[PDB]
Design a protein around this ligand. Structure first.
Ligand SMILES: Nc1ncnc2c1ncn2[C@@H]1O[C@H](COP(=O)(O)OP(=O)(O)S)[C@@H](O)[C@H]1O
Ligand SMILES: O=P(O)(O)OC[C@H]1O[C@](O)(CO)[C@@H](O)[C@@H]1O
Ligand SMILES: [Mg+2]
Length: 462
């Protein structure tokens, strides 16, 4: 059943997208930057080490990627001496995406972070593509991160413990698949916010860009020390989105969702700031269930997190509901062997061009695995040598047999990757997976970011 024509679709997509990546004016990427600390190997937050080991055991028996936060530096000095990290890389949704797009030659990459530190600026690439906004003397100044940063700000470091093959140790029992645990520092001084002056010059920033990639809203707490609610930061998160559209009407705005422990913050994010002011959303199989658990579809959410064969068809239905419940124009869910992107019929980009974006995003993710990171637009070309994962092609077979028997799409339509339903459209591709990747943090942000910028390029709104 496996047709070798898919290798031809990847090749003709890379050249067509790379030749269009000059059509984008700029991108605005904001709110998430930290320094990862990779360590080589029911509690809701980490206050004492007994909680850290407990949350590690959950990841050791499910193989699920769980992100849990710490608020005090009481355990920063705990691990830093008891357990030495071996590598420190650029981390955060906005940070990785800022480096990726700059390394791709995307023009006018505008990266903003509230906590910009002296140690943090050294991790950003040095190029005319990547610039940070500082509003000094009442006017908009886009200066390099190396220089326009605040000295009083101290860095934000996160601990990442990753492991594979499930090397087991019994205490007083083997990890199924590869899994990583993220211990994120959320000190009281970091806030998802921006200066009042930079909040004023947002129409200027929007007029010189074509898209915005926003992520990091999980830093918002319910209660603050200065007596401010999560609704204010939720309100400000929208008004920043609003003022960007006031300088550009045709700007598309993407939000890269992430695992959020607090369901009340998770729901307030999906309902108050993503529902109507956002067009694009990026997810993974586990976050779709997370999104359903707050919108009111837990039966389907449990079906997504379940292990049966019909879990993928639940992931399909989960993506469709997220596209309609949230009034979204695009939903990009990325899995290990395949991508699933459901798109509205209002989409300013045809389903034919939606496929090339996913094929390109799949080409970028493979090169991201082989090379430590990507340094040029031509480096992505290396990603075409990774073979298409047959496991991903066979996972779609369970979904294909379910869709052609339901009567939604044609057998021809699925083998090509373009399904046209009466109210929405779906694009499905098998991705390219490396047996021995070099680094596996950031691959997710890279898929949605590379796919999102490829859409703005091929947009006829130019
Ligand atoms: N070897 C390899 N080769 C190609 N592509 C890969 C590979 N490994 C993973 N992937 C992708 O990473 C995604 C996880 O991103 P996720 O959002 O879950 O993680 P982060 O938020 O840390 S970037 C997963 O859905 C896969 O499509
Ligand atoms: O929510 P936080 O603490 O910024 O962590 C975001 C995580 O996402 C990553 O960018 C991986 O996608 C890591 O660098 C980081 O651990
Ligand atoms: Mg992710």
């Amino acid at each position: 059943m496996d047709i070798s024509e898919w290798e031809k679709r990847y090749n003709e997509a890379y050249s067509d997208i790379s030749k269009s990546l000059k059509k984008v004016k700029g991108i605005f990427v904001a709110y998430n930057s930290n320094i990862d600390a990779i360590k080589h190997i029911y509690p809701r937050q980490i206050d004492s080490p007994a909680d850290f080991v407990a949350r590690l055991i959950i990841s050791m028996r499910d193989g699920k990627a769980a992100e849990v936060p710490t608020y005090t530096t009481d355990i920063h000095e705990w691990l830093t001496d008891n357990l030495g990290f071996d590598e420190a890389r650029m981390g955060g949704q906005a940070g990785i995406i800022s480096n990726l797009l700059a390394n791709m030659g995307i023009k006018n990459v505008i990266a903003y972070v509230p906590w910009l530190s002296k140690e943090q600026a050294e991790y950003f690439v040095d190029s005319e593509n990547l610039l940070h906004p500082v509003v000094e003397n009442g006017k908009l100044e886009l200066k390099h991160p190396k220089e326009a940063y605040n000295p009083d700000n101290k860095p934000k470091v996160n601990w990442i413990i990753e492991f594979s093959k499930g090397l087991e140790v019994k205490f007083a029992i083997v990890v199924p698949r590869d899994n990583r645990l993220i211990v994120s520092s959320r000190p009281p001084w970091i806030r998802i916010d921006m200066s009042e002056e930079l909040y004023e010059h947002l129409p200027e920033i929007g007029k010189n860009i074509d898209g915005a990639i926003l992520s990091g809203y999980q830093m918002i707490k319910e209660e603050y020390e200065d007596g401010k609610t999560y609704k204010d930061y939720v309100e400000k998160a929208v008004n920043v989105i609003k003022r960007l559209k006031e300088g550009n009407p045709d700007i598309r705005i993407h939000v890269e969702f992430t695992s959020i422990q607090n369901k009340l913050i998770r729901k307030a994010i999906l309902k108050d700031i993503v529902r109507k002011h956002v067009h694009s959303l990026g997810l993974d199989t586990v976050e779709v269930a997370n999104a359903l658990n707050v919108l009111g579809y837990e039966e389907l959410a449990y079906s997504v997190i379940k292990k049966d064969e019909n879990a993928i068809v639940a992931l399909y239905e989960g993506a469709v509901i997220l596209l309609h419940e949230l009034k979204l124009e695009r939903v990009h869910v990325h899995s290990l062997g395949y991508y699933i992107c459901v798109v509205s019929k209002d989409s300013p980009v045809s389903p034919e061009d939606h496929r090339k974006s996913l094929l390109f995003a799949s080409t970028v993710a493979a090169a991201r695995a082989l090379l430590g990171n990507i340094n040029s637009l031509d480096d992505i070309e290396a990603g075409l040598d990774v073979p298409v994962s047959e496991q991903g092609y066979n996972q779609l077979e369970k979904l294909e047999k379910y869709l052609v028997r339901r009567g939604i799409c044609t057998l021809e339509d699925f083998e090509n990757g373009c399904i046209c339903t009466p109210n929405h459209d779906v694009i499905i591709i098998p991705t390219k997976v490396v047996e021995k990747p070099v680094a596996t943090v950031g691959i997710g942000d890279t898929i949605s970011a590379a796919a999102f910028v490829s859409v703005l390029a091929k947009m006829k709104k130019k």
